[PDB]
Design a protein that fits this description.
Bound molecules: adenosine-5'-diphosphate, magnesium ion
Number of domains of chain A: 4
Radius of gyration of chain A: 27 Å
Chains A, B: DNA helicase II
Distance between the termini of chain A: 80 Å
PDB class: hydrolase/dna
Number of helices of chain A: 28
Number of strands of chain A: 16
Largest sheet of chain A: 8 strands, mixed
Entry title: Crystal structure of UvrD-DNA-ADPMgF3 ternary complex
Oligomer: homodimer
Assembly: tetrameric
Keywords: DNA helicase, hydrolase-DNA complex
Helix content of chain A: 40-55%
CATH topology of the largest domain in chain A: Rossmann fold
Chain lengths: ~650, ~650
DNA sequence: CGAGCACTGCAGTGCTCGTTGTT
DNA sequence: CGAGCACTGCAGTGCTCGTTGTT
């Protein structure tokens, strides 16, 4: 309450932002200048000084990590006493709005979210069903196309081709794709955002209701917003809502998904009386780390520059280690962390960052061999594991037979006599009759259109699903899950998967029961099954979340934006890894990789360590990458090359 | 003794039996005692001419006819037959090749290749020669090859298509001789060549067998004739008996000209004709005569009898095959109920497939019966498989046995794997087991395959030695179990799986019994091939006799029933499609009718199912050829329909 | 009616080629 | 380098098509 406790630590610019009149404001500043601090305290100020209701506040951002950071700080300052307040990601809040107004959004209340793997599989099926050649029209490319369209709020009709074969056909795939999804009750990530926006365009009363409620909007890491997210925010505010956005154009790293830097300027041009407050003092890092970050970003052109200075001492130098290979690299990092831990440092204060999720495997193996606890975020996590996807598909079918993605994944898993031929018929019937896979089956059976054994095998499957639905129709989430895993036969085929592969695999199925068991959700209303499935999709990059045990934090450079750690290790500092080969294979996606390097460097509070491997094996071949150009861009006085302690063993003559 | 031998004979039979040693032909109609003469002649040669039993060879074509000679010889001379050779051409030829395999150029335990096996191999062979199966039917090759051997012709021979078959024939021989396989025709030809190439061997037999007697001479084809002619040379004395009106093997080389050939070639050859019939009633005999008279080129013959007319020939029109079968069982039941023996009843048919519905009706009526010919016990799938494992144990080169059980039970050796081994043998000029031995040794087969194939070769070797020191049946039972066949047939769909498991049991019991120039197992195997038609050894039990009209030639029964007397069955469609097929079929009907001693019964169905489809045949023309006073149709209604006077109407 | 064929499901296998991040 | 398949091989199953007689 006491305004006094809200402003004490804040400096000149921070106070100006926090204690400002209600109005559209942009807080623009480099990393670690306290923008998120300003955002959280602003919320506290709006509630105590401007007496705004918690219910009129919306705090939003793109990534789960940054949203969690906002939420955590909001809890510590105002206490968990923040009911009525919406804090989450654009996808999360969109999902929320959609569940609450599914009818107006033209969606079934229990719609299922389609993740990337599911979306790619559906597309691989649709394309083949359209007779299109595989290697000719990649489903991956179709996915990029479709998602890019949705990133720009464009539906199949909004766009027309002018001959352009590739364009006109991708257009057909997109039409069929949308048809299959709506018909199956499926919603992909991009659909959540677009549908949510369309909701307020088609339902003026619904929008009015929200414009009346959310009069205070706050967006963190604004430069992450793409066009559909920007539009959504603009709409919600109208000419009555007061918005505070904080961000840094030097940390723009989502150009590949529609987030353009112009968005910051657009806010200044579009929102009523919008103004700018620039923060200039960094509190996160040592001068050594900050000086390196500054020299690095300076290498990008086209930027009105920013101050960013600190009071802190130079601190330790930035370590640079040239590893023998990727294995030595991982072992070195673990060795360094052990030392930190042996001297009283928490493992959770250590982050290991990398450009691509594929780099975590070797790090993981080194951590495991050292019996050092760790948590990995992003990439192939728990809910994306084969056995877990299989288990959830049965539950998904129980919730909705029309779930074509679920149907395809387990209709014949474990094998039950329903081979490719039979399924090809089913898919053909869905294609021609414009029906869901389960729908098509119902007919092909009530028309004796299939062979004897076929229809019989297919009939049994449908009976097994209908059975599971009734049997567990009342069971609590976790027991229904235990049941399904056993009765589906999945538990059986996995036990006898042979090797240590099947063992860990059966454990994951056990861990899933626990997850559904310990699952906690609250505040409108959604059944446990749906709420769990949507959580597994929206916060998949999270996986299982034991968060109290001290453990090393592993994640991409992207997922780390917004976070900070006393010790930071950035591995794979080599041309072809970071910058990524794709950014190299292009001429200037380099400034964005450099902005990502800037993000990486500014995560370190006390110590930053950079590593690169003379050689590593990629795709069956040994490669000798050049050292990343970002290393040389740092000031030599801030960097200290690591020279392994000289030794000597027992003399061996001959 | 002498007296007994002549007491019952008529003038002509006596003349034949008590004649000096010389080449003689006894030509006479059915049932005139030709076989009686042949048998008594043997006794005469031993008592009066004091010829040694070791100098006598009595041979004929079919197992039934040979068994008939064997039986009468035994009833006339008992045990005074030791050293005497009595059997079939294939049988005696087989005994010779065993006793002189080295000189015949055959392994000690060569395996006889029956019809099924021969055809299968020819299918595998033709495909390997990249020949189009539909362009070169394996059935054609079989007909070609055997027909070639019926004449004693080797793959040499002297046309476009002619040269191809000639080649198929060549590969076939090489394949067989390599695997150590001998087909039925190979037995006759090889036996004959054995005398053409081994003078000292021929001399030994000409010195031993100075007395040759052949029954049913008109069954001899060209290779069998040569064989006999050669054995007799210019020193051996021969008696051949037969009747050209009973020539029914034209389809396998047997020609009427052979009887005349005998009179031309054999030194001092003379003919003696018998005329009196002692088998049948006058009714049956006159129907037979009217029947045979419809064939042209006949010189007459026509035998008679002193016997009374006896019962007429019953004619029954059945409503379908099943009714035909049940009607016959009904008639036989009455015969039995009046003290008649079942074995005095024979049910004859044109083709073996007709026995099935008959067997079904007999089983349903719990009437004991015994079938000869066609798909017999040793022809059964399960029995064949079990005997194939036994064959590979006696010779891994047995390609027929190999490819039959290599993947039965299924053991991972699929068709793809086998196709490789096949082209391997085809080009490497070796057997299948030899191709597998190599390919495996010189690692050329995938890990999955190679591990299964050898796994099989290992199994056989195990079985081979594991049972080399035990009894036949013990060895059989063992091989049936360890081969997996037992387990396989036990799970086999309960649609017939049981009976098959029961047949395998019978196989053991059969091997358990069974009755010395060869090992027990090789004797059993060869018997199953040469006498396959006999099926399982018969008990003493009284039972109805079922067999084709062909197999019945030489036999006689108080009661004879001939079923399927329908156009399309007898004579069949195929008999109206070629030269003198129809007349040969009529000769077969003459043979059928003349088997009957007291009563003959002819039946035909208004409808029957052939290859599944329902047909409606007209009664056989042979029925209409019989004199109406010899036949009495079986009434299907009791009253005589009242004549229907014409009603003068203009309505449609 | 009964022996081979055509089909379909399933397991074991070399062969190809993507190849950056987040929801 | 390894997921994803395209292939290949083996089997179980439902349906098509036709052959005298003997050793
Ligand atoms: N005025 C201040 N006094 C002391 N610490 C501060 C102040 N402002 C921010 N911080 C601390 O500095 C660190 C980085 O600031 P942060 O909010 O995360 O920066 P930004 O969001 O701009 O990247 C945090 O540990 C934060 O708690
Ligand atoms: N002279 C005879 N007196 C009495 N019965 C005879 C006489 N000759 C033959 N038989 C009997 O007549 C029947 C038929 O004679 P069989 O030798 O079989 O004729 P074929 O061989 O000429 O067809 C037999 O039952 C036979 O034992
Ligand atoms: Mg921040
Ligand atoms: Mg006779």
């Amino acid at each position: 309450m006491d305004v006094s406790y809200l402003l004490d630590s804040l400096n000149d610019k921070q106070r100006e932002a926090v204690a400002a009149p209600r109005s559209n404001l942009l807080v623009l500043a480099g990393a670690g200048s306290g923008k998120t601090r300003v955002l959280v305290h602003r919320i506290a100020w709006l509630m105590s000084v401007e007496n705004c209701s918690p219910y009129s506040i919306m705090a939003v951002t793109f990534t789960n990590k940054a949203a969690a950071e906002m939420r955590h700080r909001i809890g510590q300052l105002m206490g968990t006493s923040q009911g009525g307040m919406w804090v989450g990601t654009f996808h999360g809040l969109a999902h929320r709005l959609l569940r609450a107004h599914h009818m107006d959004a033209n969606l079934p209340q229990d719609f299922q979210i389609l993740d990337s793997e599911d979306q790619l599989r559906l597309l691989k099926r649709l394309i083949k069903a359209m007779n299109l050649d595989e290697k000719q029209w990649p489903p991956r490319q179709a996915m990029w196309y479709i998602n890019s369209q949705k990133d720009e709020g464009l539906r199949p009709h909004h766009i027309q081709s002018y001959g352009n074969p590739v364009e006109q056909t991708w257009q057909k795939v997109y039409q069929a794709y949308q048809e299959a999804c709506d018909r199956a009750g499926l919603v992909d990530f991009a659909e959540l955002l677009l549908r949510a926006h369309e909701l307020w365009l088609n339902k003026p009363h619904i929008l009015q209701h929200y414009r009346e409620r959310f009069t205070n909007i706050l967006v963190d890491e604004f430069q992450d917003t793409n066009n559909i997210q920007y539009a959504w925010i603009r709409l919600l505010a109208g000419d009555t809502g007061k918005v505070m956005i904080v961000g840094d154009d030097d940390q723009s790293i989502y150009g590949w998904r529609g987030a353009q830097v112009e968005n910051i300027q657009r806010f200044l041009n579009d929102f009523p009386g919008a103004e700018t407050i620039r923060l200039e003092q960094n509190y996160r890092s040592t001068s050594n780390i900050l000086s390196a970050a500054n020299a690095l970003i300076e290498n990008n052109n086209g930027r009105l520059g920013k101050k960013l200075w600190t009071d802190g001492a130079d601190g330790e130098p930035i370590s640079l280690y040239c590893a023998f290979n990727e294995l030595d690299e991982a072992r070195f990092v673990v060795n360094r962390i052990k030392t930190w831990q042996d001297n009283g440092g928490a493992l959770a204060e250590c982050a290991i960052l990398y450009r691509s999720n594929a780099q975590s495997r070797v790090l993981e193996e080194a951590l495991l061999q050292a019996s050092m606890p760790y948590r990995i975020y992003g990439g192939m996590r728990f809910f994306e594991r084969q056995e877990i996807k299989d288990a959830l598909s049965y539950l998904r079918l129980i919730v909705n037979r029309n779930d074509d993605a679920a149907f395809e994944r387990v209709v014949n898993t474990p094998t039950r006599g329903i081979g490719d031929r039979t399924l090809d018929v089913v898919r053909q019937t869905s294609r021609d009759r414009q029906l869901t896979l389960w729908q098509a089956c119902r007919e092909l059976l009530q028309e004796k259109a299939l062979a004897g054994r076929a229809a019989s095998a297919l009939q049994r499957f449908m009976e097994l699903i209908d059975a599971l639905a009734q049997e567990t129709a009342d069971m609590p989430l976790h027991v229904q899950t235990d049941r399904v895993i056993k009765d589906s036969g999945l538990r059986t085929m996995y036990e006898q998967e042979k090797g240590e592969k099947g063992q860990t695999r059966i454990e994951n199925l056990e861990e899933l029961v626990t997850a559904t068991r310990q699952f906690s959700y609250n505040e409108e209303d959604l059944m446990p099954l749906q709420a769990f499935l949507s959580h597994a999709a929206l916060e998949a990059g999270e996986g299982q979340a034991d968060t109290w045990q001290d453990a090393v934090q592993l994640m991409t450079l992207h997922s780390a934006k917004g976070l900070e750690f006393p010790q930071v290790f950035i591995v794979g500092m080599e041309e072809g890894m970071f910058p990524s080969q794709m950014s190299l294979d292009e001429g200037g996606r380099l400034e964005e990789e450099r902005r990502l390097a800037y993000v990486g460097v500014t995560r370190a509070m006390q110590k930053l360590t950079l590593t690169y491997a003379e050689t590593r094996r990629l795709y069956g071949k040994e490669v000798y990458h050049r050292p990343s150009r970002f290393i040389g861009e740092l000031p030599e006085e801030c960097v200290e090359e690591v020279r392994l302690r000289a030794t000597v063993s027992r003399p061996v003559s001959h």
